[PDB]
Design a protein around this ligand. Sequence first.
Ligand SMILES: *[C@@H]1O[C@H](CO)[C@@H](O[C@@H]2O[C@H](CO)[C@@H](O)[C@H](O)[C@H]2NC(C)=O)[C@H](O)[C@H]1NC(C)=O
Ligand SMILES: *[C@@H]1O[C@H](CO)[C@@H](O[C@@H]2O[C@H](CO)[C@@H](O)[C@H](O)[C@H]2NC(C)=O)[C@H](O)[C@H]1NC(C)=O
Ligand SMILES: NCCc1c[nH]c2ccc(O)cc12
Ligand SMILES: NCCc1c[nH]c2ccc(O)cc12
Ligand SMILES: NCCc1c[nH]c2ccc(O)cc12
Ligand SMILES: NCCc1c[nH]c2ccc(O)cc12
Ligand SMILES: NCCc1c[nH]c2ccc(O)cc12
Lengths: 385, 385, 385, 385, 385
Amino acid sequence: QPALLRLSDHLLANYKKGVRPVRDWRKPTTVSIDVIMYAILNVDEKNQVLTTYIWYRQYWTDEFLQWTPEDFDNVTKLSIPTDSIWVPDILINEFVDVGKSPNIPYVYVHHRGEVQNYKPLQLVTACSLDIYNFPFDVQNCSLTFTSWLHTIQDINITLWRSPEEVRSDKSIFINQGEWELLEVFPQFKEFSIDISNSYAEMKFYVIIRRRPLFYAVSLLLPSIFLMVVDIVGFCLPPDSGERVSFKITLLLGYSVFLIIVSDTLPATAIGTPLIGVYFVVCMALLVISLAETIFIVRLVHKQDLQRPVPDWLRHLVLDRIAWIRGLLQELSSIRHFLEKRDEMREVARDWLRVGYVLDRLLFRIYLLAVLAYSITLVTLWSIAW
Amino acid sequence: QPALLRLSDHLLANYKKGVRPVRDWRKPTTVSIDVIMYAILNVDEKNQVLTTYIWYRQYWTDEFLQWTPEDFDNVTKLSIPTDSIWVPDILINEFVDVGKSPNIPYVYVHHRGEVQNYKPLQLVTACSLDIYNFPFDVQNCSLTFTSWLHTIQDINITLWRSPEEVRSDKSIFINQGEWELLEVFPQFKEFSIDISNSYAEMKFYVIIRRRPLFYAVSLLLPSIFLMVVDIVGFCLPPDSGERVSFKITLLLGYSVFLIIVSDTLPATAIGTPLIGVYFVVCMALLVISLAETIFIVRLVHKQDLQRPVPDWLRHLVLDRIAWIRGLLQELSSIRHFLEKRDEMREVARDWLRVGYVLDRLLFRIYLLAVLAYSITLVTLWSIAW
Amino acid sequence: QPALLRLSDHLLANYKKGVRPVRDWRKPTTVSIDVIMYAILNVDEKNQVLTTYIWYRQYWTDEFLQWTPEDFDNVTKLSIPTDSIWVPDILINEFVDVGKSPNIPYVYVHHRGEVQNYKPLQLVTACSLDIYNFPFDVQNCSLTFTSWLHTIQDINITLWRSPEEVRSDKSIFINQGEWELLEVFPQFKEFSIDISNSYAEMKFYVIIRRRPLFYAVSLLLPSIFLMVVDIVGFCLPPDSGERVSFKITLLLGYSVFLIIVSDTLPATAIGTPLIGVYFVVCMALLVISLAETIFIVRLVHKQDLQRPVPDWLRHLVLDRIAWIRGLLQELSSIRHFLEKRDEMREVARDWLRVGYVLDRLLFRIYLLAVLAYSITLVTLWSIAW
Amino acid sequence: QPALLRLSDHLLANYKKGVRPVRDWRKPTTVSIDVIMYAILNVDEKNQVLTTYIWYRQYWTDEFLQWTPEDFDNVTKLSIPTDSIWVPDILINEFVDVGKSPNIPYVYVHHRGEVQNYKPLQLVTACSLDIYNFPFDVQNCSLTFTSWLHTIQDINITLWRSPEEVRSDKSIFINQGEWELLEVFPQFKEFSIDISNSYAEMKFYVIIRRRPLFYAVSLLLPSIFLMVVDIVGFCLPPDSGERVSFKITLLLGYSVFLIIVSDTLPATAIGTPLIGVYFVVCMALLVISLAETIFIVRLVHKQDLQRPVPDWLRHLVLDRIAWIRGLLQELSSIRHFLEKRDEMREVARDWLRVGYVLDRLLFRIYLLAVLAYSITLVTLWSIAW
Amino acid sequence: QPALLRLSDHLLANYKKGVRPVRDWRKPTTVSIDVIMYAILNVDEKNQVLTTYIWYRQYWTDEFLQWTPEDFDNVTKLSIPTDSIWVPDILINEFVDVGKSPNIPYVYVHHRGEVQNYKPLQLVTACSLDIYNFPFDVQNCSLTFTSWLHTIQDINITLWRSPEEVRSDKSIFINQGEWELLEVFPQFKEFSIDISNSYAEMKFYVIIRRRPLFYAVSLLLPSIFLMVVDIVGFCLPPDSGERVSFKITLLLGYSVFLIIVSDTLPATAIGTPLIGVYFVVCMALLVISLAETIFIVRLVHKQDLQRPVPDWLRHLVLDRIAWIRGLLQELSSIRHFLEKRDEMREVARDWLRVGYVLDRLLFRIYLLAVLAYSITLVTLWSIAW
Ligand SMILES: *[C@@H]1O[C@H](CO)[C@@H](O[C@@H]2O[C@H](CO)[C@@H](O)[C@H](O)[C@H]2NC(C)=O)[C@H](O)[C@H]1NC(C)=O
Ligand SMILES: *[C@@H]1O[C@H](CO)[C@@H](O[C@@H]2O[C@H](CO)[C@@H](O)[C@H](O)[C@H]2NC(C)=O)[C@H](O)[C@H]1NC(C)=O
Ligand SMILES: NCCc1c[nH]c2ccc(O)cc12
Ligand SMILES: NCCc1c[nH]c2ccc(O)cc12
Ligand SMILES: NCCc1c[nH]c2ccc(O)cc12
Ligand SMILES: NCCc1c[nH]c2ccc(O)cc12
Ligand SMILES: NCCc1c[nH]c2ccc(O)cc12
């Protein structure tokens, strides 16, 4: 007689699979698991969901499947079709769709009754991701493995191995994607939503962090030269007039860019992602950059003005010192046509002087406002890094 | 004899699962349920659909599965494969796709015949969402649980617990997403589409509200500085000419933004979402802001005009008081070249005076139109909040 | 003996489900159906497909499942697992994917052999939608229910109820979405693609119409103020020069908008959706609005021109009446420098006169072209409505 | 005895369905098929895939299912559950996903053993589409029906009917979508990837063509008025200066449009779709249209130039003929201020003359370049049509 | 007796399929496979996933299915339903979703026990794609075929054929899509994540390369004329003023284009795709092209300046040589009005001279900077090609 199927006929002859198998019904049949996290596929923050590919193991002690290695030629391990035996009802509490994993048809058994189960599982799972510190984030995500039906009286869930070995386990991992995990933290919990019920749950605080080294040259790099185009915008002379239309073109251009960052960030109602304030401060800087630009051209244009008062003109002098035959009546009619016409040009030349001194000093105080603001952010770089 | 499977063989030997099980066929086998709402996954308003993750319970009294705790060593609870017994045919009337939930293989039984069923269920469900008060909305959504086939003669549906306990149940809930529910309202209904038929239905008026604290800084924040760019637009001098091209650039810029809000809002045929009118009033404000801008430059430009009539000029003076040898003929030819040429400059200077007084007064009445309009909206904030 | 399963064992003992059940094989077992249309989920016109949620009924006379209410305690209705009996092979000919409906496990039977089947069914179905009269359309869509295999010899398909009751049936319906149906028209058809074959088909001319009350304030409302910005565009003085750049900014702005309406409309090869011509006439109106703008500035600019000929100048006068010591040679050198220089300004002033009279008359004939065009469209409103 | 199921019990008592059924194993059981193409659902060229709804037929001679019409009351046709008999393993070699078709549960049998199978099938299939002649294309797509496992020794595949009847078969077809087929070409092939193996394959060169009557008014109609805005762009006077900003606005506007056509066209690496060159020639026409615009304003502006040399000025005259008391020293100081100042205006007037003659002649040679180019394309219309 | 099913009844009478079949349990039942890669469907780099259609083969020696060709009329090959026998548990370690392949119901057997299995399989698989050399890339992608459960004690995996024949196998392949493979490299590996376990894995280094002949005329062709519009931008005269607004329009236009290339490229955290630096160098070239444009107009404008100092003016002369009755007091008042007014025009004319010499020399050094930069890239073409 060929011996291997001789075991299976002897084993599975009366194994009624519709029983949580035990010798004594008071005893909880303890399942015992781990995870080995393989990769992080995608984090679509706008959908508040997370897809993860996880290698996975189980065993549990089965009373009924015990044999002896005698009379079957020293066989201690054996392969069994999964749907021909019992299985625990465990699944994760935070799934969105479980239809992506193939069903492993086969499991092992030992002669003590330790039936061993491996399977892969992918789950698009939903854990509350944090988006506050955006390019430097840690995602305290949670996978809570749970018997959906059975209680502590029926089964308990525990770990395969030492939780320290779960913690720093990077034995197989696809890095160089977007993400990278620092550890996986297991923890038992005893769950009871109500009275007279009690459920085994054992969470997995999987924490991952993002490599910012792509997002810096895709989001911080657009923001920096948007400064220097306006910085070189002040080097335009004020009297040209398109210097106003210069800024608004960039105010149009920055308006385009803030729409692009709008949908890329999720709709998370814990508040603004913190880089968005550092982002949104830039337009108000541009508005006051624009508010400077309108001010001098309201100040300086040929508008038939009044004269500059000397207290501000000495203040302009201080700021310059701080920043650095009755034929006569026809002939009199000629100068009378020009004694004001040349002078109204020079009254316009007087207010013209006021433009350039403000052009110098507001350029520095705009530049020193930005440059002192910039050094604050790179201190936040080394704190985030 | 091991005792647990001794029960299952004694129980399921003749349980023909193709029977709605009862001792007497007049008796309606009453199922009895609840919901425990876990999370709200997504509300895509444009698709008029809603995805919801719901923990769920059932029991019903089964006549045939009764045993005694005697002769089976005091066992009162026991696990059974679901497809080996009867099940009620209930499902929700408003689904779009039920393929996302895993099938729980196992159910409990008691020695009285109370077979107990738990399962999770996600349904992309379609209820008529309201979009009228957009950032402050309540969504009276409905889940109507229904035996698809059986009538009141066959089964009745009732609640597990007190409906008060269903009402304020936030025992497990993923908040800090977008949504948050205030209560879940159950209600029995007796349904009959026709005569000679009657179906048990028990609705669930699930109501949720949106946290506006993200949408305010993503939709109200763009709208406010679009005012102040035009507010500072009047501080441009009128004679520049790009002041017209200034506004149209923003009229172009606001035209961009209204397309962005178009697809974000659904196609709901109950009317405009009410914030859209408050949104669409802004362009007509900008048009009359533009209509001011064209008016003064039609009024003020060097066009070889007629003189200003004094009744409007005294009205301009009132508004200023309200807002605050035959060689002679060659020489006569010289002044004749200039007695009009200097004067036509000054006739242009006369209409130039009319521009700035209108520049002052229309600036206030534009500003006071906007500022009085703005205080109306913040009163609507505290009513919505 | 408990009596209900006593029937089922007596009934299903020898019911070989692999038989289209009849006593005599010449007799066609007539199935008999209806529809009760619940809701219209989505009409994505670009995909030429339609998703519809339909409640659905069947019966057919089964020879083999007859019993007597005697000897089974007056039981005339009974629930049966669907996969334990015969079923007809009907499905709809125009599906794209049938995987969204759950399988109802249960059906009724009567003591005459009328087995009754209810089930829901959703189908993304493909019927040739019409997009010609876009915001006011009726969609003569068709659902042709068909035995996929069996012929008229095997089965016939008929209606449950009177076709009048199918016609005006709005007993359950989710309105206030986008769509609304006026009626559902059933009709039998006898189908034969070839000789020696004949198939029962019974169509359903489901017709729905769209509530335009959202699309009017999302597509007609952008089109109307695009007129009045150019209408107020003529109130710009011609000599400014940005009046040309004014229009092209809107010609740029209208170019943006026609791309937005491009993908929103499907690729239907029956021709242009009829509102698109009314849409596309606007740019050619803007081009000739632009062609006016270039014409006057080609006419009016300081270009050292020739003089205006009086026949057009009297025509300009008619249109104005229709719209309303040898020291002398140094002194002679002075006027010779200015007798032309002042005159070439006035020759430019002469052509300047030609601009404003054309500015008046072309403004009216532009306005009267648009306003008379507009009253044509509102007559088409009351015909469409 | 009821006779119909009397056959089925007599027939299917020992029909072991795990046998490719034949009396003699050398004989290849020839299956025999056709297609009846119903509709073309979508051609997403960017995904290089094609979805098609096909009605489909089979028969094959089964040895084992033969009966006599005697002793069963002259029954020659009969319905059988598909999963209770053999089936051939055929499928198409170019699928992407087969999960969209429902499983027809039923098949016919005849008393000779001709079991007949009908089923529908939709396949998103991948055939190498051609995109070269874009709005006028023919798509030589291929469906190669293949026994996936069995060889020529086991089965052969042939056609049901005459291949001529397959060729012009438009008996049922949903036209008025986008596409329309001219014919379906079947052809047997004998396939062997290697030695000692041989597989029956029978292709289907399905060829379809596109109705261009939508794409012409969605892609050719934008291209034509983009010419005439620049054509009317030359009617702007050169000295205005925004005439340069005119063209670049359209150069910006055409830059927008070429991005819109970029993603609409696939990434097919056989080269550019041929209309794209006719599309991309337009920008280089606009660049040289712009290069004209910069040239004259570089030529004509008040820049204190040198004089025009008469050889080009007589060439400008040829092109015009081709296109059509010591008080004196104060008085001498007056003319010395103006003998050059009036002249430098006239030196600027001399180069001003050069602008308008080039404005005339370059306008024609731009127009005649475009108009002669346009008549080349309409000849390509009648060749494509 | 019909002989073919006589074998199947004799064969499958006691084949308990729940056994990894062998005579002696120490022997590892070696499976033996290959791949025949058919096509590459899509490479969505942003999702870091890859879909591939692969024809596939297996055999393994089965102990139990041996027969003799005697007593069954010389039958050496035979078709068997797959779910009626054993199967190995192999699958690929890098899948995302296996639900797209149909289940082939049938397999072959030989009289030695070589059961032969063919099936197709599509997998959206995840391998770490490289995006560095973007239009000229090679993708060292990996398919690691693995028994998910069984160890080296249970099964070993080997190749069907010689690995050289796998290497250059292009026997069937859909080219002319986007991709093309140069070879497929198989390699055995012996895998053990831990101690006391050992798994057969046999990788497939599938390497493919991209045909750049579409992406060159879709991404390199936009970049080249963006140079020459600014190259012709310097031919604008500086004094016009819109020459500044010229460049910023293209700086706006290039800002549009870099957003388009942003999402087309993935989020790969190995760094920037190398063409992006060659792309992003263009804006900084445009900024310094803009920085030239602001410089000369800051240098040249009528601003009532100081005089040019002769050391720079002789340097400007060097660069030009490198690039090429008391009536008198009324009359004195006349010249005093003009002795400066004409001179301040000429002081403005002096700085005007400085503009054009810088216009010549900066034009060359801008052009020679670009042209010498361009020849570096075409050397990188022939290295990449
Ligand atoms: C398999 O079927 C094909 C038909 O598709 C057979 O080809 C025919 O063979 C006969 C005689 O062998 C010829 O008269 C026909 O002209 C052939 N038709 C075509 C389309 O080739 C082929 O012989 C069959 N092979 C086997 C082994 O049965
Ligand atoms: C498992 O299969 C591999 C083949 O992939 C075996 O490796 C071969 O082993 C033989 C002798 O052991 C050598 O001659 C070959 O050169 C090896 N080939 C390769 C590619 O390594 C391996 O021995 C097998 N192991 C078991 C336990 O059967
Ligand atoms: N060769 C993969 C088998 C395997 C080895 N170690 C594992 C750990 C977890 C798991 O799911 C599977 C495995
Ligand atoms: N541990 C989860 C079991 C569970 C406890 N309480 C529940 C309530 C509803 C439900 O579907 C399931 C449950
Ligand atoms: N309670 C829903 C049962 C039901 C009542 N009337 C119906 C009509 C059609 C249908 O599919 C189902 C029904
Ligand atoms: N009434 C549809 C049955 C039918 C008739 N002719 C057909 C041809 C092909 C097919 O798959 C099916 C059919
Ligand atoms: N006619 C396709 C059968 C076939 C022939 N050679 C093959 C190689 C691999 C495979 O999966 C299948 C095949």
